[PDB]
């Protein structure tokens, strides 16, 4: 399909993994996770937000894989919501 | 084409305006201005960056109009480069 991403609880794609194809207003409520330590964008372009409901700091994810938060330009693994860039 | 945006030096679509369809690594050099106070996204989806060469804070622009910087989630008129999200 057009949108798909895998997010991991630990860096270097380790720990538990969750896969999704839709926007997520709160990763704590949906995935019971406080942070994202690494991920892989398999399809589409996405954006990470610091706070719930797409508020706070924004990070564009337009590459393929990210082993650590620094790879998507963040000084911390803090992420609470994310969504697809629809086009 | 797929990407087109108009940037304004003053809020609410007033003041000097430039229309462009390509990425801009530095507005001071390309457009002889230092702050964008409003803008219209006519075609495509873009992203504004705090510092030149796409560095610093990021702001997604996926709606059509923004009357003030706060509308793209910025606390100040600080934006010095921007580019198209090519999908």
From Swiss-Prot, chains A, B:
Residues 3-43, 44-86 form the Beta/gamma crystallin 'Greek key' domain. It comes from the Eukaryota. Disulfide bonds: none annotated. Monomer. Crystallins are the dominant structural components of the vertebrate eye lens. It is linked to Cataract 20, multiple types: An opacification of the crystalline lens of the eye that frequently results in visual impairment or blindness. Opacities vary in morphology, are often confined to a portion of the lens, and may be static or progressive. In general, the more posteriorly located and dense an opacity, the greater the impact on visual function. CTRCT20 includes progressive polymorphic anterior, posterior, or peripheral cortical. Has a two-domain beta-structure, folded into four very similar Greek key motifs. Belongs to the beta/gamma-crystallin family. This is Gamma-crystallin S. It comes from Homo sapiens (Human).
